[PDB]
Amino acid sequence: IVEGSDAEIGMSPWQVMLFRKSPQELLCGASLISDRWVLTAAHCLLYPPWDKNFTENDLLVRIGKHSRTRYERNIEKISMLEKIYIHPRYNWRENLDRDIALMKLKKPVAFSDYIHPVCLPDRETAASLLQAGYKGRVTGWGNLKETGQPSVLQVVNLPIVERPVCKDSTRIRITDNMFCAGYKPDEGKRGDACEGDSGGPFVMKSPFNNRWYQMGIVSWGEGCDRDGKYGFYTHVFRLKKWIQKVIDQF
């Protein structure tokens, strides 16, 4: 996260770290949506241009974390993966359209002060909140600058951007399964996701029921925190029927 701040303890209890077993390293962010299911970006698991195609046994998820590098004894919980599910129309060739994946854990994780699931939006919450100017929150342990790394989880709040501005910021084809967020050059304020944050959540706190909803998944950007560029996020609600199909059947 570029131009964010340290998270408060328990501020993002749905945060998940995707962790490679060997070499031990941070792969991506992710989020907890129930005691057995973790949501992330498809590109965190499958990206053939970079020879990336992880299997379940390659990975762990670490839940309840604050410190990036510490083993947070008596706080974090480490879970093994039973199965990975990638959206069948995830477009890794062109533009990361439908950049979404689910991971089922081998055993349910116990909730605590530090471990708690985020809500997924329904149609009405998406319609109400996914509007240009409305701010969401992005969290992660990724790089502090495009070109170092944080001691603890970082947090930044960023406004959703008008779709024509998103499209006009890039040569990549932007689809209805994506939205973009970030400050414009003239807005003064700054901030973005960066390498290591992808797969993590873009959340909004509903003013109707005071619950946090995951509206986006950190998907891609051209650099980090560049003037006139924006971060692109998977539109979770637009892919919710696939989420529900997977959970209901597996």
């Binding site: 408060e8 002060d113 708690h116 699931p117 509007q131 100017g133 946090w212």
Partner: peptide
């Protein structure tokens, strides 16, 4: 979950985090 999105150390204790008000202030409708 019936309890999703309600943080033990914040909403469940009626404590506010340091920047959630910035989000609320951006939500102009309703």
């Amino acid at each position: 979950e019936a309890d999703c999105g309600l943080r033990p150390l914040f909403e469940k204790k009626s404590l506010e985090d340091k920047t959630e008000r910035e989000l609320l202030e951006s939500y102009i409708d309703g």
